């Protein structure tokens, strides 16, 4: 009595039928380019994992974004190169330019396009209905892409979706977490940041799929519609699935832990409660009214399900009628 099993609904076996070289990132030889071409100009952010810079190629003055690497593995940063190397080109993808070797750090230096970013802080306080549905079918087309690639994102959260508001240009970010599926691994549920973790990872179901990141995006959705950011803000993880059983309800939380035999840490127990479900419309207000739509709660509704089989593809919710002004205005002559 161990947990059933899952295998992913769509995509299931695209690695399966890949050239080992494909997935197998272990093997992977990297081609290093030149870090004189670089100079650092502003430090961005900092993180457990790098540093981040603008900085300029000064062979050609194009802004670009540095990621120096912290020491890590070998294997951890081949991982991250290949996916990248993988997706490029890809739409919303963001574009790994060059591999550098730090000079300093003796670590590798990942160089990105720049993309001329307002933070979502501030962006997502401005951001109009039309916004909101334009930037979701963006992170969609890139979700699909990277699904139909064998590739788990696996940190989808507004600080890795960077957009260019201006110029209606997004793209996603921050591929140190993603994976390659197939079907039958138990992966590691230490996976997204607290508030856009699935139940699954929540409640130690290990063998998850490319749905884990339309759970993230319905978590974003929900910030963006409701204007709560985030909107399941847990203070643990054990709080973040209370937090999320507050909303859904405890009654198919705990269909969704039978379907799958798991077995509830017993540190649940006291805290998890018994809460009924909620109307999406329990989280209306006169200050986001504006975004939500009968299209908008359906489509939320369709994304956060606990039962990741469940949940709407990428393709699948480029499809829902929340999109379809989208739809027709990214049909152009050309």
Request: glycine share 4%; aromatic share 12%.
């Amino acid at each position: 009595s161990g947990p059933v099993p899952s295998r992913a609904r769509v995509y299931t076996d695209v690695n399966t039928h890949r050239p080992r070289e494909y997935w197998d990132y272990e093997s992977h030889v990297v081609e290093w380019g030149n870090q004189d071409d670089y100079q650092l100009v502003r430090k961005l952010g900092r993180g457990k994992y790098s540093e981040v810079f603008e900085a300029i190629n000064i062979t050609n003055n194009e802004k670009v974004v540095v990621k120096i690497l912290k020491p890590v593995k070998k294997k951890k940063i081949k991982r991250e190169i290949k996916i990248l190397e993988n997706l490029r080109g890809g739409p919303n993808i963001i574009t790994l330019a060059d591999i550098v070797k730090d000079p300093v750090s003796r670590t590798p230096a990942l160089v990105f396009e720049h993309v001329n970013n307002t933070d979502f802080k501030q962006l997502y306080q401005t951001l109009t209905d039309y916004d909101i549905r334009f930037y979701m079918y963006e992170i969609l087309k890139a979700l699909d892409y990277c699904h139909s690639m064998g590739i788990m994102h696996r940190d989808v959260k507004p600080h890795n979706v960077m957009i260019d508001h201006e110029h209606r240009k997004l793209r996603l970010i921050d591929w140190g977490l993603a994976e390659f599926y197939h079907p039958g691994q138990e992966y590691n549920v230490r996976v997204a940041s607290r508030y856009f973790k699935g139940p699954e990872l929540l409640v130690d179901y290990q063998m998850y799929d490319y749905s884990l990141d339309m759970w993230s995006l319905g978590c974003m959705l929900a910030s963006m519609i409701f204007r709560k950011e985030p909107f399941f803000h847990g203070h643990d993880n054990y709080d973040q699935l209370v937090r999320i059983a507050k909303v859904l309800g405890t009654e198919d939380l705990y269909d969704y832990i039978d379907k799958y035999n798991i077995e509830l840490d017993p540190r649940f127990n006291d805290i998890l409660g018994r809460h009924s479900r909620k109307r999406w419309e329990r989280f209306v207000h006169s200050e986001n009214q504006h975004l939500v739509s009968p299209e908008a709660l359906d489509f939320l509704d369709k994304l956060l399900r606990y039962d990741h089989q469940s949940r709407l593809t990428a393709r699948e919710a480029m499809e829902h009628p929340y999109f379809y002004t989208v739809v027709k205005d990214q049909a152009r002559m050309g």
